[PDB]
Structures are given as C-alpha cells and as structure tokens.
Design an enzyme around this catalytic site. Structure first.
Site, PDB file in Angstrom:
ATOM      1  N   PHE B  84      10.118 -82.921-132.939  1.00  0.00           N
ATOM      2  CA  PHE B  84      10.541 -81.838-132.060  1.00  0.00           C
ATOM      3  C   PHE B  84      10.944 -82.431-130.718  1.00  0.00           C
ATOM      4  O   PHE B  84      10.476 -83.505-130.330  1.00  0.00           O
ATOM      5  CB  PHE B  84       9.442 -80.788-131.876  1.00  0.00           C
ATOM      6  N   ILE B  87      13.296 -79.128-124.107  1.00  0.00           N
ATOM      7  CA  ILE B  87      14.393 -78.874-123.180  1.00  0.00           C
ATOM      8  C   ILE B  87      13.777 -78.498-121.840  1.00  0.00           C
ATOM      9  O   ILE B  87      12.968 -77.565-121.762  1.00  0.00           O
ATOM     10  CB  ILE B  87      15.329 -77.770-123.696  1.00  0.00           C
ATOM     11  N   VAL B  88      14.161 -79.219-120.787  1.00  0.00           N
ATOM     12  CA  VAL B  88      13.508 -79.092-119.496  1.00  0.00           C
ATOM     13  C   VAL B  88      14.393 -78.424-118.448  1.00  0.00           C
ATOM     14  O   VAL B  88      13.866 -77.769-117.542  1.00  0.00           O
ATOM     15  CB  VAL B  88      13.027 -80.472-119.001  1.00  0.00           C
ATOM     16  N   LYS B  99      33.931 -68.794-117.838  1.00  0.00           N
ATOM     17  CA  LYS B  99      34.679 -69.360-118.957  1.00  0.00           C
ATOM     18  C   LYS B  99      33.937 -69.169-120.275  1.00  0.00           C
ATOM     19  O   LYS B  99      34.548 -68.831-121.296  1.00  0.00           O
ATOM     20  CB  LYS B  99      34.950 -70.843-118.708  1.00  0.00           C
ATOM     21  N   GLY B 102      28.497 -71.912-121.944  1.00  0.00           N
ATOM     22  CA  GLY B 102      27.113 -71.972-122.388  1.00  0.00           C
ATOM     23  C   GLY B 102      26.990 -72.117-123.892  1.00  0.00           C
ATOM     24  O   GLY B 102      26.228 -72.949-124.390  1.00  0.00           O
ATOM     25  N   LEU B 123      11.473 -76.783-128.219  1.00  0.00           N
ATOM     26  CA  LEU B 123      10.543 -75.988-127.430  1.00  0.00           C
ATOM     27  C   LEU B 123      10.956 -76.045-125.968  1.00  0.00           C
ATOM     28  O   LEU B 123      11.281 -77.116-125.448  1.00  0.00           O
ATOM     29  CB  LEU B 123       9.101 -76.482-127.590  1.00  0.00           C
ATOM     30  N   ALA B 130      17.276 -65.914-117.947  1.00  0.00           N
ATOM     31  CA  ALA B 130      18.029 -66.634-118.964  1.00  0.00           C
ATOM     32  C   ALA B 130      17.601 -66.276-120.380  1.00  0.00           C
ATOM     33  O   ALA B 130      18.088 -66.892-121.332  1.00  0.00           O
ATOM     34  CB  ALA B 130      17.888 -68.144-118.753  1.00  0.00           C
TER      35      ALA B 130
END
Lengths: 78, 352, 355, 69
Positions: B84, B87-88, B99, B102, B123, B130
């Site tokens: 795994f 994402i920070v 645009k 994302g 995770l 968001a």
C-alpha cells in the site's frame, strides 16, 4: 486498436520503450532507496503502546556523550 | 476526450516524476510544487511542508508546461513491502483548476505506480472540501484493510477524514474512457438483439372497435412474453433509500462542509474522558446518526431534528456554557435552522 | 441533483415509468408521448393520443439473464452507467444505484468475474450475439419470481436487522508507540532531528518561471547559481542526519531500560572506565565495542585479584578457604571498630575461561 | 526583496567552491564518515593479520621500558 493493458517491465530495455510502459513520459534515474536507513521491519504495531514515555530531553542528553567531538583530553586515555 | 487529453497529445503539457536527486531540473519542479501546496494549505506551517516535499523517500508526479511551468501534482510515500502507498499532498493551481486536470492527474499516478511496483491499496487523509473530488475517483470512506497493516505507519493529520481505495488489477486507467464505452457497446448490442420495442404493434384488439376498456397486460402476446407482473410494476417504483435521502444528503454534506461542525465530526474517546459516557446516557455524534439513517431507523423527519437537538444538548451538558464547546454548539444549531428555514417543508418544526 | 441521468414521467397520469414495462404513442401526431401500462391498460388518453386507430410500441424492461444467472440486462447497464458517473472503483454508491439490495461486496465481486477476470479481457467471453442459451434456459416468469422472492426476504431481513453499531473513534495511527516520546519505529524517523532548523533557510524559496540557463552566455545566471548553492547545503544537512540515525540503530541505544539497568548493576570503578571509552563507538561495530569494553573490565578485575592475593600471603594464610574466612572476620572487625569479578577469580575453583 | 547579486555573495561562492574542490580531495576516502556495520561481514577493525604486528610492537616497547626501568 490500441493496447488495453499494462505490459510488464523487462531488464535492459531501451529508454523510449520504458516510457511507453509508464505512459507518464517520466521516471527518475536513481531510486535513492540505498540511502534509506533500512526497510521497515514489517512487524505488528497494533499492540497497545506503552503509557509512560521518557522525556525526549533525557534521551537527548543520554546519547550526547556518544557523539561529542574528539579532543586531546581523550587522546590521552589511550 | 477532455481538454487535458488533447493538450497532452499535442505537447502543450507533460508529466514529470521527480525526486530530490540533486539535479537542476528536479529541484525546480520540486520547489514549484512546494509553493502550490503552501498556497492551498495555509493552516499548516511552511517548514513542515518543505521537509516533506524535499524528503529523500517521497516521490512526486507533476504536470509541467512548455516554459518550465508547473500547474499541479501529487506526493506519496510507497511502502513496497506492505502492499500500500500513502498520499500526503494534492492540489492544482486555482487559476487553472477550471480545465479539469484533477481527473487526468490521478489516472497517471494510478497507472504509473501500477506499472512500476506491486502496490494495491491507497490511504490518505482527505481535506474537508476535497471529499467530493476523492469520491469520484473511486475512493470510499469505509476502510477494508486490517488494523495491523497501516497502524503506526501512516501519519495522523488533525482535521482530516481517512479514506481508502483498492486498485482493480490488470487495467489501464488512462484509456478508461474508451474501454467502458466498448463494454457499454458490447452489452447494448446484446440487449438490442432481443428487444421487441422496435415492433410497431397494432392497436389493442379490445379497443380496435373504438371502445376503451381495461386490458390485462399479461393477456397481450408481446407483454406476456416480456414477463411483466403486477408485483414488479409496483415494486419498481420504490427507491432503495428514503424519499428524502438526496435532500438530507445535501444537508448532511452542507453541515459537514460547514467548519462550525468540526467538534462533532467524530465521537469522543472513552479512554481520554471517563465521565463523558457516565453523564450522557445517549451520547451521539454525526457518525452515529448517519449510520442509523442508513439503517432506516429514522422513520420521520422529527427523529433527525430531535437527534440534532440532542447533539447540542449533550455538548452543552458535558461542556460548560462559558467554554467554547457549548457556544460553538449553539452557533452550529443556528446554522442548522438556517438550512432548515431555507427549506419550507421543515420551517414550521422550530419551537417557540 | 448531482445525478446526470434523465427522469421519465408519463404524460397522462404523471407516474414514473423509467423502470417498468411501458408503451408509447408512435403516431407522428404525438411526439415522445409515453403511456404507462396502467394508463395504456385503463386507456386514459390525453392531448392527441387516440388508443383506437394508431399503432403503438411496447417497451419491455429486458428482464432476463445474459451472463450471470442472478443478474439481468437492466442490472448490467446500471452497473456500467454507474461506472461512468460515480467512477469505476466507487463500489458503495454504484451498488446503491443498481438497487436490489446488493451490498458493495457482491457488486465488486460480480464485476471482477464478469469483466476483469474474463479471458477476453476488454470484453466478456460471450461477446457473440448468436449465443442465446442462457435467455432460453430459464423462463422470464420463473426468473422474475426469484427476483421478487429474494427482494421480499431481504427487505424483511433489513427491517428486522439489528441497528448498526456507532462508528468508534477512527483508529489514529499514532506512530509514537515506541517508548520514547517523539520516535516513529514504523517510519524510522524522529520528530526533532539533529538540525530541525535547517529548513528555515529554504522554506520561502521561489524560482523564476521558465528560467534555468542564460539565453546569451549559456551559463547559470548569478541568482540561480546562488539559489542552487543554498540547496546544496541543505542536502548535506540531510545526509548528516542519516549517519547519526545509522549509528543509533546499531549498538541498541533505543533500549533505555536495558542499557541503564546494567550500568546500575556495575560498580563504581567499572562505571567510570566505561563512561571514559564511550565516544569511540562511532568507529567500531557492535561486537568490537563489546570486546573492547570487556577487555578493560578483565584487566581491572585481574589487578584487584592479584593485589588481594599478595596481601594474604603476608599474613601467613595458606589456603584459599582460610583466606575467605579471614576476610569475613576482618569485615566484622572493621565493623567492630552477587559476588564481584574480583571475588570469582579468588574462588577455590577457577572459571573455565581462565585455563 | 531586492537587482544584481551583491559582490559579497559572488566572492563567497567561489571561496566555498575553492575550499571544497582542492582541500576536500584529501578526505575522499569513504571511511572518514561511516560506521562499519556487522551485517556487512568481516568488517571488524581488529583483524588478526594486523593485530599480530601491533602485539609484537607493544611487546617490544614493554621490553625497552623494562630495560630502562
């Protein structure tokens, strides 16, 4: 018409082909993983952690004698 | 094909995966990402962001424009042995957000990690505003990984909401828009090989004489072969969720979106405080009510209003009025009635 | 509503008709004039619709298995339609969209077998429209009966289902488990490092867009070469931290309880000697440091034993047994007025490692 | 926030660079900053092949001291 999958990597392949696999047109050269202190020991940390830590100041002063600069004072011990 | 797709094909943009090797370009790309994250996350200190971005164990996928201009990117730390990755950080410049980069940036990151290592799960600690973006990208708020796998490894972030994803194996996300169409076309053609709706049937034989009388749908040849039944006809008109779920889902998101409901996001911990449960015989928070709502235990709107009122009373009961807990709790109550008053249906449920 | 779908309403009774068998007025006089089966059964006409002399169309719900014996055409589309809107991967909502009380797990498993695990990867296995066995293997009425049966019991189970337990507090990772406040064994990273203030010099750094090389000279412009030089120092600061961490991992300096207890157990003279030789551990591995320290202890104890024995021989003591007896009586006399290393060497039986 | 680079910043980079490039070459050996690890193998700094000579020299000095003493 196009390839609907991720083809695996192979050793000793051309740079252009390597970008085709990734599709990002990107990768770093050196992984830099060799400078890591080491891989995580891969254990179970779910065990209830201790409830009495030691003041970080005490630990900082505990290891300080192990890192002080060399001096002629301790060059006379030996 | 969205504008991000065409721009990349023509060479307007390009993605660079860069770590802190020490080169000239790798430093410029990293520094640009550092400023962007700093703008979008003013609450956190600038020193902390600098350390994380310039670390030697993280990676970073960035979008770069012709004159070495960086618009957005993501940062992550892959735990190769634990199957795994974390994402920070994530953000795109506000000016260029219209645009739609994302979606296209997440696809590249998922594709790149998938085709470079053997990681499966992601995770992250999503931001409050968001959550919508993450949800549309396959993430979920329910965690399926075991406790031992990730506890003690990822880093807690106050004010966040943990989320998880499970990448589907043996797929290329970038060409998703064409692949699902093919699976859509494959199934649709199958359906079109049977449907009799293309047959322009004559007027019903009972009404051919000009007299309109009830006709049993099961009597007709076409309908009877269709297997129509009275049971399915009545059952097909009952939505899975409650009739007001969407409106409450709007309200639920609104109150969650409101920064004034932060203390009630998660329940209080028994270990930290012992008297919280002893004093309150009905301790409730937003999570508890939402789960009960999912169980359809709330038959009428009054149950929701009473639960919301009890939340504020419990906060006032456990925490003194002088303390900010109760004052914010009463302030949040005003916000709820602001939304409810905006709803004519529930405007009359406010007591005098 | 966030949903991008289209809702279909009958033009006569205003009864939702999207998810049932429905009929439409095909006459050119009426355009998109849908009449629900109840309306087209009861024959309630509106606008220009004439149920008498215009031919119509029967729109069926396409309820029959194609791929899986437990799934019909409508369920498959809603699965694929949900992928476009809710995004392929979001199994919680797409399961809700499909309906039929199929928890996210069943939906997730179904898609993997039907599509992802198919040998014809981009497609299913039965792509050929000519194969029509599954439709004819079970009649529509039977298959419909099962759907009504599963639905009713599931609804009964849900109504009688126990209430869900309230979500406990999220299991914060709290990487501070190790018995030193501000240490993360999972990450091998401290919270307060050697030069934690090294980021104060580059956390306001910014770069000129699109630059990096002088257009005229071809060399880095003066500001850029200065900016990079202040990044070189920071990289060296990171490397110095790693070496400090590398040393601490070896020698097991993270065991405060174990290292201290032995220091307490040792005597005064040994404690001073070990404290004097501590710095040199930076250069030797674990075993060498252990050998180095043990040797100093061995020499110190041997000197004490030899000095002890020479004192006995001047008192006319002629046996190791009587020597210990004398020491005990001397301790009593001075009072009147586990064994240590220096006491194990002078025992009647010598240790094995001294032969 | 400033303009051209000051002379002090232009004459300090070379001074730093001159020191690193010329003097630093002497310390190029990799062992000046690393701590040998047990896992690597026979990394002990007390190899017998060298300890044999050190013991002999130490014995020689002892004999000289005794003769002087």
């Amino acid at each position: 018409p196009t390839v609907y999958e991720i083809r695996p990597v192979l050793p000793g392949m051309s740079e252009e082909e390597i970008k085709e696999i990734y599709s990002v047109a990107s990768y770093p050269k050196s992984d830099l993983a060799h400078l890591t202190c080491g891989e995580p020991p891969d254990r179970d940390f779910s065990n209830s952690k201790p409830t009495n830590q030691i003041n970080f100041s005490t630990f900082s002063s505990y290891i300080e004698p192990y890192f002080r600069p060399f001096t002629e004072e301790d060059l006379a011990f030996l | 094909e969205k504008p991000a797709v065409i721009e990349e094909r023509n060479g307007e943009i390009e993605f660079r995966v860069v770590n802190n090797d020490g080169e000239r370009e790798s430093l410029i790309i990293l520094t640009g990402l550092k400023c962007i994250f700093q703008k979008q996350l003013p609450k956190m200190p600038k020193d902390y962001i600098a350390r994380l971005v310039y670390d030697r164990t993280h990676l970073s996928i960035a979008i770069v424009k012709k004159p070495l201009e960086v618009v957005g990117g993501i940062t992550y730390r892959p735990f190769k042995n634990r199957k795994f990755a974390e994402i920070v950080f994530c953000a795109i410049s506000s000016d260029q957000q219209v645009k739609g980069y994302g979606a296209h940036l997440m696809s590249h990151l998922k594709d790149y990690v998938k085709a470079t290592t053997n990681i499966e799960h992601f995770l992250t600690y999503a931001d409050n505003y968001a959550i919508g973006y993450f949800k549309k990208q396959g993430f979920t708020k329910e965690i399926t990984l075991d406790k031992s796998v990730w506890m003690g490894y990822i880093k807690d972030y106050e004010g966040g909401t943990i989320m998880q994803c499970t990448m589907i194996p043996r797929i290329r996300y970038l060409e998703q828009g064409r692949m699902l169409l093919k699976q859509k076309e494959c199934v649709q053609a199958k359906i079109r090989a049977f449907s009799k709706s293309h047959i322009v049937h004559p007027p019903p034989k009972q009404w051919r004489n000009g007299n309109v009388t009830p006709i049993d749908p099961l009597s007709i040849d076409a309908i009877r072969e269709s297997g129509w039944s009275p049971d399915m006809d009545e059952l097909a008109r009952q939505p899975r969720h409650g009739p007001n779920y969407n409106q409450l889902l709007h309200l639920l998101n609104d109150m969650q979106n409101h920064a004034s409901s932060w203390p009630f996001l998660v329940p209080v911990n028994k270990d930290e405080v012992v008297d919280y449960y002893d004093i309150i015989k009905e301790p409730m928070d937003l999570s508890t009510m939402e789960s009960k709502l999912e169980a359809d235990q709330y038959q009428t709107p009054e149950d929701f209003i009473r639960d919301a009122k009890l939340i504020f009373d419990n906060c006032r009961k456990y925490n003194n009025e002088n303390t900010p807990y109760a004052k914010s709790a009463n302030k949040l109550e005003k916000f709820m009635w602001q939304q409810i008053r905006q709803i004519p249906e529930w405007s009359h449920l406010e007591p005098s | 509503s966030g949903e991008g779908g289209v809702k279909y309403i009958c033009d006569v009774c205003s009864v939702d008709i999207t998810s049932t068998v429905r009929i439409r007025c095909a006459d050119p006089a009426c355009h998109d004039y849908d009449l629900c089966v109840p309306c087209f059964a009861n024959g309630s006409s509106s606008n220009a619709h004439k149920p008498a002399t215009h031919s119509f169309r029967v729109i069926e719900q396409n309820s029959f298995p194609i791929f899986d014996p437990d799934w019909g055409a409508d369920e498959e589309l809603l699965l694929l339609e949900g992928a476009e809107i809710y995004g392929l991967g979001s199994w919680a909502d797409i399961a809700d969209h499909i309906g039929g009380y199929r928890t996210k797990d069943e939906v997730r498993d179904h898609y993997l077998k039907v599509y992802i695990e198919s040998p014809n990867f981009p497609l299913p296995e039965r792509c050929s429209p000519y194969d029509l066995e599954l439709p004819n293997s079970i009649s529509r009425e039977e298959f419909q009966a099962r759907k009504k049966r599963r639905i009713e019991e599931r609804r009964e189970a849900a109504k009688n289902a126990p209430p869900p337990q309230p979500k406990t507090k999220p299991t914060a990772s709290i990487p501070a488990c190790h018995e030193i406040q501000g240490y993360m064994p999972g990450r091998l990273e401290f919270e307060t490092e050697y030069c934690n203030e090294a980021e104060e010099a580059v956390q306001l750094m910014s770069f000129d867009p699109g630059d990096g090389i002088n257009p005229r000279t071809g060399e880095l412009e003066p500001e850029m070469e200065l900016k990079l030089t202040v990044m070189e120092i920071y990289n060296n600061r990171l490397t110095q931290r790693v070496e400090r961490k590398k040393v601490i991992f070896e020698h097991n300096l993270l065991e405060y309880r174990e290292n201290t207890k032995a220091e307490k157990k040792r005597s005064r003279e040994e404690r001073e000697l070990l404290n004097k030789a501590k710095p040199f551990a930076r250069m030797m591995n674990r075993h060498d440091f252990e050998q180095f320290c043990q040797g100093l202890i061995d020499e110190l104890n041997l000197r004490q034993a030899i000095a002890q024995l020479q004192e006995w021989r001047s008192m006319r003591i002629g046996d190791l047994k009587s020597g210990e007896k004398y020491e005990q009586e001397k301790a009593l006399r001075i009072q009147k007025s586990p064994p240590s290393g220096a006491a194990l060497l002078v025992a009647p039986e010598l240790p094995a490692r001294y032969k | 926030m400033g303009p051209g680079i000051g002379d002090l910043a232009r004459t300090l980079m070379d001074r730093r660079r001159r020191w690193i490039e010329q003097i630093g070459a002497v310390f190029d050996d990799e062992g000046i900053t690393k701590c040998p690890r047990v896992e690597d193998g026979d990394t002990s700094i007390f190899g017998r092949e060298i300890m044999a000579e050190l013991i002999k020299r130490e014995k020689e000095a002892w004999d000289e001291e005794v003769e002087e003493e």
